[PDB]
Each structure stands twice: as structure tokens, then as C-alpha cells.
Amino acid sequence: KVNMDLRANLKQVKKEDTEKEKDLRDVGDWRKNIEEKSGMEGRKKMFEAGES
């Protein structure tokens, strides 16, 4: 999966603001973190839509 290794290589975790972030394959904790406090933040804040 070269084309892939490149995609991430270039792309990769890229963000400019907690709210504005870009999660990629290399998500892992990085994502979970930002992910939690980034998009899902406002989202749920707008309508968690059930818990757990």
C-alpha cells in the first residue's frame, strides 16, 4: 500500500484549530483527542443524541 503510505505521509494529522482539524489514517490517540475536542464537541453539544 505505497500510494497509501504516501497519502498519509503527505497528509497526516493536520489541524489549525481544535475545532478545525483533519484526522487521517494516523488517527490513533491523536484523533480520539482532537476528535473528541474538535468536531464531536460542538456536534454533541448541538445534539449528543443519546449517551454511551
| CATH of residue 26 | 6.10.250.180
Task: Work out how many domains the chain is built from and give that number.
Answer: 1
**For residues 26 and 50, what is the distance between their CA atoms, to the nearest angstrom?**
28
Q: DSSP characters for the chain?
A: -HHHHHHHHHSSSEESSSSSEE--SS-HHHHHHHHHTTHHHHHHHHH--S--
**Solving technique for this entry?**
NMR
Q: How many Å apart are CA 13 and CA 35, to the nearest integer?
A: 11
Name which of 50, 45, 1, 49 is nearest 25 in CA terms: 1
**What is the domain range of residue 17?**
1-52
What is the C-alpha separation between 10 and 29, in angstroms, rounded?
A: 19
Output the nine-digit C-alpha cell for 17.
484549530
